[PDB]
Amino acid sequence: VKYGWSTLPKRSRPTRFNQVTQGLPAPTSGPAAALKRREKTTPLRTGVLAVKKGMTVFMGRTGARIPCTVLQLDRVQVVANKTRAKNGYWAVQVGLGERRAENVGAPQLGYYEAKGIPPKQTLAEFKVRNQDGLLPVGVQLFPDWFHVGQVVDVRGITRGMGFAGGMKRHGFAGQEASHGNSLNHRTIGSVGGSQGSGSRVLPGKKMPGRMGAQQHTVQNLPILMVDNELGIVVVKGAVAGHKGAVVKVQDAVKKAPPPEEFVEATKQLLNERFPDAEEKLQAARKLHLELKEARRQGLIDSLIKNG
Amino acid sequence: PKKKTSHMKKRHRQMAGKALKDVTHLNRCPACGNLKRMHHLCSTCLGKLKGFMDRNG
Amino acid sequence: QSTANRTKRMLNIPPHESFLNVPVEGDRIIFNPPSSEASVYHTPFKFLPRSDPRRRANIYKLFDLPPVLYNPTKSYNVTPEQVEEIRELRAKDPKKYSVTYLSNKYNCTKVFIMMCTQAPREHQEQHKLARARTAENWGPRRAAAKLDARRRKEMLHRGEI
Amino acid sequence: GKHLEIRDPTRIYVAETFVNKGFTRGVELDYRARGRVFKMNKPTTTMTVVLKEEKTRIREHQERVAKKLRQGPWVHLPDRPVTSQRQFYSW
Amino acid sequence: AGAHVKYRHLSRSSAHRQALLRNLVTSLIKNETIHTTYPKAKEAQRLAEKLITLSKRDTETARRSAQGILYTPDQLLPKLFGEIRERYANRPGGYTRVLRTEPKDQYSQAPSAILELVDGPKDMRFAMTAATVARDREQKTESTDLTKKNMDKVTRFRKDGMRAFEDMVASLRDMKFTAGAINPKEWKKLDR
Amino acid sequence: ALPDHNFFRIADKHTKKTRTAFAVFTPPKSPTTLPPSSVVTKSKAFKIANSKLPPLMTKPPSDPMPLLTQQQIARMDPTGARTALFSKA
RNA sequence: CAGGCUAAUUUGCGCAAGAGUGUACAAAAUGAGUGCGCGGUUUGGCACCUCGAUGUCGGCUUGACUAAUCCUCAUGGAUG
RNA sequence: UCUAUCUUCUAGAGGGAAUUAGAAUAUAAUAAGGAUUAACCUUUGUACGAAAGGAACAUGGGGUACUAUUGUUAU
RNA sequence: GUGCUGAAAGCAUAUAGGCACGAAAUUUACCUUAAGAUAUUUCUUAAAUAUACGUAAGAAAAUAUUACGUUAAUAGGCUUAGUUUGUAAGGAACUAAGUACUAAUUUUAUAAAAAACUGAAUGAUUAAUAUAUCUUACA
Ligand SMILES: [K+]
Ligand SMILES: [K+]
Ligand SMILES: [Mg+2]
Ligand SMILES: [Mg+2]
Ligand SMILES: [Mg+2]
Ligand SMILES: [Mg+2]
Ligand SMILES: [Mg+2]
Ligand SMILES: [Mg+2]
Ligand SMILES: [Mg+2]
Ligand SMILES: [Mg+2]
Ligand SMILES: [Mg+2]
Ligand SMILES: [Mg+2]
Ligand SMILES: [Mg+2]
Ligand SMILES: [Mg+2]
Ligand SMILES: [Mg+2]
Ligand SMILES: [Mg+2]
Ligand SMILES: [Mg+2]
Ligand SMILES: [Mg+2]
Ligand SMILES: [Mg+2]
Ligand SMILES: [Mg+2]
Ligand SMILES: [Mg+2]
Ligand SMILES: [Mg+2]
Ligand SMILES: [Zn+2]
């Protein structure tokens, strides 16, 4: 084997031929069984991409001081919906910020060209529970996407720390300071046993190396403030990363989804702020074919200088 | 060392990914046309202009 | 193995079951049709001259059909007068009256339209160039697989495949 | 495998090149601890360049191309040899 | 493990690094230009642009802080609050220009640069842009947009401006400085 | 219905020809504000924070921290006597 | 010295049987002198084997594994 | 006393073969690891008990923000 | 460990057969790295793309990773507001915002060779032929 208990060649595609409608037992693995054992945890609604702007305190009336982190939403749009019949799972692709057309590549320029969206800075997918979580492509998400008191999870890349030792990386105690120690104060000491333990270093052994610059999730962080004009969503506690880094905010998996009324009001606000999200998308898709066909033939110069 | 490194395992260490990289960031100089590094000042025109400003001024 | 003799024993394959029924007494001629492809020197009885005296019964007699693959049917729907119209149209507007247009109009096979008429040289040279300009858009990997298809077809007809 | 476009077949290029080692430039003494001394040989070396014209590369390419069109095409069912001889028929 | 470096340490002690920067800024004013390594030219560039900012202040504290950076104030302060103060009176910052150059020391092959004072008697970009214009006129070529963009940079804030630039071009053509210059139309036909 | 867009062109440096061009979409130049939403929900557990929506598809203030400190000071000090009692005067 | 073979002995255990104790009543608990065993920790025997040792071991750093369980979790028996 | 050659190990890279012409971006099945403690109040001082004593079960103890909950005063 | 139904074996039995309760252990869940199928009405006919160089950084032993390069706020400078020092003076490592003042800056830099086989479905264009004889036509 290479990964797990399967000896199947990686180039073989037998999935469609083993169907439960033919009387076979529903497999315990596979995309279907993976979604069924995550149905409760999976968030009902999509998330938003936000930029960490700094830390502060939320002073409340009558005496409450609550340390909080400020996350700003900078033109958060819906770029693509990942359905189960096309991708194998439900998710929404969200975009953040903007990027200069010259820096965006042609493969991606034609990707946004087929949607009517300006090129974004970053893209990220948020898994939703079912088809009710998919939103129209091209709608902007504002801080009001959440409500005050709603607990969320913030996923961000932690601060980089380069090559760390044993103390900072794994919390090793180190050795003595002055009682005869010899050049071994912050070193890791023993790395194993002897011939009875395999005459080798055991896989998974803790050693110095690079630390940081990895994704970290902080769960169950309430929402203390929601300001649309500023574009910020103030969350309690600390968040991973530096100021100016993009983080992913979504409902908490270990907490019940927001009430049915809220999940519907937020969806009802996208139909008001953007009454025509499909007409603007179908028009962009209709234009992409004309330009894609002009590029193929080689007459793209004519359309550019048409008006 | 426990053993002597063979001709194969020593040739891997010496040349596998350690081939000298060809400098390709070369542009011509506007004043004289001579080849120079990109974003850098011509060495033959620097000395000549640097000496031309020392005689007359 | 260690020796060549030891290798011959590990790689042994026994002879056919038929050869292992040795007669205890006397000699016997047995029928052992082999499970192999017959050569072209085993002339079928239909290709033997009536004069030839070796046309015996099957050796089985001395002791439905498979699925169709290609059963064509020839049809003659073009009268002599219609062969003159094909020669007029083709020579008048060879771009509008192609062999496909004329084939569908007269209900004929595309090859036949070429048997009775030929496009002007200017038009013929225009077709070879189009396919010649198409053979320059092929990379080294596609142009090598397109040449192999042309060699495997000539080899097939030389008895080499 | 590098693709070139030769407009001047007389252009000189570096066909071959190898480095050899020559005599010993000098000898330095390495004074270590414990009154130990070691000899350090200063090396001198040479290089050989074999210069050829671009006509050699245009000829060597035509040979490689002719050797690739001489190995024949790929056939689906090849006639591989059976390398064991036995004094009986197995079929 | 700790914080990042605030600036370059240049493998020197604290006091040795404060004297190295005061010497490069002293030679920059005295000579109007210096040819040193790139990391040294980029660390003194921040101290030379802050010393010319003190020369544009009317307080006495600036006159005392300028005395605490130079190493011969009695001989260089009159030049700082004199010629230099008048030169950079109307410029909003950016008084120095660091230009990358080929190694000054070939032994170590350490990348070098040229730190200079813009609009100065030894401005190397004002002369290199004058040599380009001299060649273009002397070969009936058309200046490139980058040459036109550099021609205006070296003549916008300069006192004489275009007149001083046309004189440099005239002095480089009467000297035949552009003799043997490869025409820009023959650069695509050259390999060596 | 077709939103505004501009064309980005990728040209060759060898032949000076258009290799491929795309229609880059740009957000509305004049930002369009919309009337107040009519979605009113009554629930004790939550409130929709749709008080003041900004113009659609516009960059928010880069530094909301100093703007946020003046919102809490104006909420924790509606008069200013506390802010002035420790000012630099 | 460690490793190797053995298991007399052990501060390592299990099972079988049941004199006896348990006011009564063998097996709630308890279990004389014994039998059948597992295991390789202590003290030993041997000597295949020259090597880091005579307290063969202590502390520190860092482990990995075992389960015959001190704590935390589920649970049968207990005229006692 | 020892500047680590080899295997193992911790990190990070050069090249690569991919259903296969090559890419940009977002990515699933799956794989390998990580996290892993305990206590206290709360039973109608209830069941049980002559009394002295005294449980099991279950809920809650995120809020001087939201919310939940319990009180306090005003309507 | 504790049950329901229930026979072999008229009884009994949570024994076979048919259902079930049940632990800090296991599995999932949760989190991270890895994996790289797939997706886009995505791009590319000698490119798409990547690299190099230059200004850098949420990255950092090298390498790699993530931006930017004038149609530009990447870094430095300058300016204002903060913060700090202190006489509400004078300064300043620092933070934020603004500002093209300085540097991303010389005349087609480098790498990238680029659509296999069989079956099925479905188009376009074309002599996609053979045999007899040595002359034939024109002037
Ligand atoms: K020490
Ligand atoms: K039981
Ligand atoms: Mg960092
Ligand atoms: Mg310590
Ligand atoms: Mg082993
Ligand atoms: Mg080993
Ligand atoms: Mg000595
Ligand atoms: Mg040094
Ligand atoms: Mg000192
Ligand atoms: Mg008794
Ligand atoms: Mg126990
Ligand atoms: Mg009991
Ligand atoms: Mg090594
Ligand atoms: Mg996964
Ligand atoms: Mg617990
Ligand atoms: Mg309260
Ligand atoms: Mg029964
Ligand atoms: Mg029963
Ligand atoms: Mg496509
Ligand atoms: Mg290119
Ligand atoms: Mg570095
Ligand atoms: Mg700046
Ligand atoms: Zn020059």
UniProtKB/Swiss-Prot annotation, chain A:
GO terms for cellular component: mitochondrial large ribosomal subunit. GO terms for molecular function: structural constituent of ribosome. Residues 18-39, 175-200 are annotated as: Disordered. One of its GO terms (biological process) is translation. Its main location: mitochondrion. Signal peptide: none annotated. Residues 178-187 have a biased composition (Polar residues). It is found in: Mitochondrion. Component of the mitochondrial large ribosomal subunit (mt-LSU). Mature N.crassa 74S mitochondrial ribosomes consist of a small (37S) and a large (54S) subunit. The 37S small subunit contains a 16S ribosomal RNA (16S mt-rRNA) and 32 different proteins. The 54S large subunit contains a 23S rRNA (23S mt-rRNA) and 42 different proteins. Component of the mitochondrial ribosome (mitoribosome), a dedicated translation machinery responsible for the synthesis of mitochondrial genome-encoded proteins, including at least some of the essential transmembrane subunits of the mitochondrial respiratory chain. The mitoribosomes are attached to the mitochondrial inner membrane and translation products are cotranslationally integrated into the membrane. Belongs to the universal ribosomal protein uL3 family. This is Large ribosomal subunit protein uL3m. It comes from Neurospora crassa (strain ATCC 24698 / 74-OR23-1A / CBS 708.71 / DSM 1257 / FGSC 987). The gene is mrpl9. The chain holds residues 63 to 369 of 384 of the full protein.
Swiss-Prot record, chain B:
It is found in: Mitochondrion. Zn(2+) binds at residues 29, 32, 42, 45. Coiled coil: none annotated. MRPL32 precursor is processed by the m-AAA protease (composed of YTA12/RCA1 and YTA10/AFG3), which cleaves the N-terminal transit peptide. Cleavage by the m-AAA protease takes place prior to assembly into the large subunit, an essential step for mitochondrial ribosome (mitoribosome) assembly. Proper processing by the m-AAA protease is dependent on the zinc-binding region within the tightly folded C-terminal domain of MRPL32: zinc-dependent folding halts degradation initiated from the N-terminus and triggers the release of mature MRPL32. Component of the mitochondrial large ribosomal subunit (mt-LSU). Mature N.crassa 74S mitochondrial ribosomes consist of a small (37S) and a large (54S) subunit. The 37S small subunit contains a 16S ribosomal RNA (16S mt-rRNA) and 32 different proteins. The 54S large subunit contains a 23S rRNA (23S mt-rRNA) and 42 different proteins. bL32m has a zinc binding site. Belongs to the bacterial ribosomal protein bL32 family. This is Large ribosomal subunit protein bL32m. The gene is mrpl32. The chain holds residues 66 to 122 of 129 of the full protein.
UniProtKB/Swiss-Prot annotation, chain C:
Keywords: Mitochondrion, Ribonucleoprotein, Ribosomal protein. One of its GO terms (cellular component) is mitochondrial large ribosomal subunit. It comes from Neurospora crassa (strain ATCC 24698 / 74-OR23-1A / CBS 708.71 / DSM 1257 / FGSC 987). The chain holds residues 41 to 225 of 225 of the full protein. This is Large ribosomal subunit protein mL58. It is found in: Mitochondrion. Belongs to the mitochondrion-specific ribosomal protein mL58 family. One of its GO terms (molecular function) is structural constituent of ribosome. Component of the mitochondrial large ribosomal subunit (mt-LSU). Mature N.crassa 74S mitochondrial ribosomes consist of a small (37S) and a large (54S) subunit. The 37S small subunit contains a 16S ribosomal RNA (16S mt-rRNA) and 32 different proteins. The 54S large subunit contains a 23S rRNA (23S mt-rRNA) and 42 different proteins. Component of the mitochondrial ribosome (mitoribosome), a dedicated translation machinery responsible for the synthesis of mitochondrial genome-encoded proteins, including at least some of the essential transmembrane subunits of the mitochondrial respiratory chain. The mitoribosomes are attached to the mitochondrial inner membrane and translation products are cotranslationally integrated into the membrane. The gene is mrpl20. The keyword Ribosomal protein applies.
Curated annotation (Swiss-Prot), chain E:
The gene is mrpl8. It comes from the Eukaryota. Belongs to the bacterial ribosomal protein bL17 family. Keywords: Mitochondrion, Ribonucleoprotein, Ribosomal protein. This is Large ribosomal subunit protein bL17m. It is found in: Mitochondrion. The keyword Chloroplast does not apply. GO terms for molecular function: structural constituent of ribosome. Component of the mitochondrial ribosome (mitoribosome), a dedicated translation machinery responsible for the synthesis of mitochondrial genome-encoded proteins, including at least some of the essential transmembrane subunits of the mitochondrial respiratory chain. The mitoribosomes are attached to the mitochondrial inner membrane and translation products are cotranslationally integrated into the membrane. NCBIfam families: L17. Pfam families: Ribosomal_L17. GO terms for cellular component: mitochondrial large ribosomal subunit.
